[PDB]
């Protein structure tokens, strides 16, 4: 037998949502989900294209 | 219980005008709730930490806005 194992973790820039004046709960998870990153990260803007 | 303790807040009754007063109030706020949001400053109050709520009115962590409204209400002036 054989195989591989790995561990990493990812996360949110603390100011990424940009709209908030302040975060809730004072200590929050930085792991992306529905409530903290979806459609909200100020560092990235996605535009669809058509007609090409 | 919050199991993180409580913040015990007492508001001391004060006179604003003839027949206008801000009543005293006693509330306990789950530690993480108080920590999350509060507008108590300049209010004529006193506060201490405890392992269990010191007061009959308690805002458990799962309140957020019931608490915010309750904290804004510390400024309400009545008869």
């Amino acid at each position: 037998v054989m195989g591989f194992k790995t561990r990493y973790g990812i996360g949110i820039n603390p100011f990424a949502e940009s709209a908030a004046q302040a975060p809730a709960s004072r200590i929050q998870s930085g792991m992306p989900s529905i409530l903290n990153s979806l459609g909200k990260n100020a560092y990235f803007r996605r535009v669809y294209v058509k007609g090409i | 219980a919050s199991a993180r303790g409580y913040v015990n807040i007492k508001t001391f009754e004060q006179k604003l005008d003839g027949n206008k007063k801000i009543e005293g109030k006693e509330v306990s706020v789950a530690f993480p709730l108080y920590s999350d949001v509060h507008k108590i400053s300049g209010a004529h109050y006193q506060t201490f930490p405890s392992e269990k709520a010191a007061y009959s009115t308690v805002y458990e962590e799962n309140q957020r806005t019931e608490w915010i409204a309750a904290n804004e209400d510390l400024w309400k002036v009545t008869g």
Binding site: - | R4, P32, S35, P49, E51
Partner: protein, 40 residues
Amino acid sequence: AEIGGDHGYNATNIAAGQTSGAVTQIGPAVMGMVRRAIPN
């Protein structure tokens, strides 16, 4: 009145660095580790 606040005198709150006021802490440093002694 930028009140830093304090911990809840609750072991979890301390460990997590959570404050009741303005500033969140890194955590409670370390004072080392105590290992149980081995009998002779």
